């Protein structure tokens, strides 16, 4: 258990290194790997069920996990210029993430200013 949290913290850190310094695409891939945040469907709630269970160390970290996601998600999905462009994904991801954030704002520091980054 102790080691597991350890690796998670390291993974999150590598995500940080690559978050900024560009590499928007890479950040999503890694964050998803964490298996903390709902990329799939409305499984956002399962992410609720598995949230309280979370160890104290991680439970604290989630705030940044979200908003990192809505950032890369934003910047990467800068509306492009002028073909296959599936904007839909990396869009659904924000949606699931927001539902997630919506469900646990009380158990979070109190910055659903995801909204600012969310829109434009």
């Amino acid at each position: 258990f102790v080691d597991s949290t350890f690796y998670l913290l390291l993974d999150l850190i590598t995500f940080f290194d690559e978050y900024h310094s560009g590499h928007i695409d890479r950040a999503f891939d890694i964050i998803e790997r964490l298996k903390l945040v709902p990329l799939n469907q409305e499984s956002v709630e399962e992410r609720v069920a598995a949230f309280r269970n979370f160890s104290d160390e991680i439970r604290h970290n989630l705030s940044e996990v979200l908003l990192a996601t809505m950032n890369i998600l934003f910047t990467q999905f800068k509306r492009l210029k002028g073909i296959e462009d599936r904007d839909s994904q990396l869009r659904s991801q924000a949606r699931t993430l927001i539902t997630f954030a919506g469900m646990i704002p009380y158990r979070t520091s109190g910055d659903t200013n995801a909204r600012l980054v969310q829109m434009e």
Partner: protein, 118 residues
Amino acid sequence: GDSSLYIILKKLLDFILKTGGGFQRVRTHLYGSLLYYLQIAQRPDEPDTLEAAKKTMWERLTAPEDVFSKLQRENIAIIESYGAALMEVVCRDACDGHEIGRMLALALLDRIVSVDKQ
């Protein structure tokens, strides 16, 4: 969590500084509420508890708890502002009126006193 209590604590400080309330009687009530709040926040704990918390922070080896220290810091900031203003009011008041309200204000001054000792 006595977070909800925190808001009342703020209101109390506000009224005192304002020194509205013809009644010292009113201010005695404010002093009493503040006294309990200050006391309540730190359930009787002594330097040992503080040292343990610091070590845990030690450094965030993993996930630490530093909840009570954080709460004390917030209280102290609020109090500071309001503080200069209110200290003036609380001491003058002291003397007089209320030999009564006195029992309440001196106790408030002493609790406050530890914290914000320093």
